[PDB]
Amino acid sequence: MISLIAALAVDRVIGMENAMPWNLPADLAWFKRNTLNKPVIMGRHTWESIGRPLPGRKNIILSSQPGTDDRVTWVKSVDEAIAACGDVPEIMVIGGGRVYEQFLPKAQKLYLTHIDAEVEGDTHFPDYEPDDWESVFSEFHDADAQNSHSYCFEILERR
Ligand SMILES: NC(=O)c1ccc[n+]([C@@H]2O[C@H](COP(=O)([O-])OP(=O)(O)OC[C@H]3O[C@@H](n4cnc5c(N)ncnc54)[C@H](OP(=O)(O)O)[C@@H]3O)[C@@H](O)[C@H]2O)c1
Ligand SMILES: Nc1nc(=O)c2nc(CNc3ccc(C(=O)N[C@@H](CCC(=O)O)C(=O)O)cc3)cnc2[nH]1
Ligand SMILES: [Mn+2]
Ligand SMILES: [Mn+2]
Ligand SMILES: [Mn+2]
Numbered sequence: 366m367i368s369l370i371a372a373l374a375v376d377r378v379i380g381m382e383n384a385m386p387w388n389l390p391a392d393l394a395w396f397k398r399n400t401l402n403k404p405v406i407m408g409r410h411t412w413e414s415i416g417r418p419l420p421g422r423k424n425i426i427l428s429s430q431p432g433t434d435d436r437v438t439w440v441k442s443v444d445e446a447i448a449a450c451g452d453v454p455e456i457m458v459i460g461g462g463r464v465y466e467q468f469l470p471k472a473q474k475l476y477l478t479h480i481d482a483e484v485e486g487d488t489h490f491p492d493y494e495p496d497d498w499e500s501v502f503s504e505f506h507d508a509d510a511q512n513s514h515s516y517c518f519e520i521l522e523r524r
Pocket of ligand 3: 442444
């Protein structure tokens with residue numbers, strides 16, 4: 366099973382200048398809980414944005430060019446990325462925009478954080494078709510002293 370996990374600001378913005386400009390510790394904690402002990406697939410730009418391997422997860426990087434770091438696994442196509450995960454129950458695709466576009470048709474589950482923040486960005490989450498997806502979990506949180514925007518955790522499963 367393939368799942369996508371992402372945090373979206375208003376208008377599906379996910380990034381600006383290879384960064385995420387907000388800071389929501391509660392959402393990063395949600396990301397860690399839902400990805401720990403699973404393989405994570407990311408594109409090369411997102412690998413450079415994170416800047417280090419994510420501990421406790423098999424890190425798989427998509428790039429058309431040879432890898433430059435043997436602490437992670439480098440693959441050259443979507444099919445190779447999936448195969449490199451082996452026989453696991455759940456593969457987590459962690460972006461970015463181009464990678465989400467390619468894996469969306471193959472995904473059965475979406476873990477989405479909707480952030481009440483207006484961000485100028487240059488990268489968006491794919492338009493998906495709402496009729497294809499059922500919301501099975503949602504949890505709203507107001508802003509607090511640690512998290513400066515309100516946010517909604519949602520899990521959707523392909524109907
Ligand atoms: N809010 C969120 O949840 C979230 C999550 C992740 C990322 N982001 C943000 O998203 C932005 C990065 O997204 P992006 O769309 O620019 O880049 P990306 O999807 O992270 O990376 C694209 C790169 O991945 C490689 N790639 C993708 N598909 C491939 C394929 N089928 N075969 C081989 N290589 C492939 C290519 O690398 P080569 O050029 O080396 O061939 C391509 O240039 C940043 O702003 C980051 O902060 C946000
Ligand atoms: N919901 C969601 N939020 C995100 O921030 C996110 N980020 C990415 C890609 N970028 C990043 C950037 C930093 C870290 C990171 O530092 N993660 C630590 C945080 C642990 C914690 O804060 O409790 C980790 O171990 O996962 C992960 C992904 C992909 N999907 C996401 N999905
Ligand atoms: Mn092929
Ligand atoms: Mn197999
Ligand atoms: Mn806000």
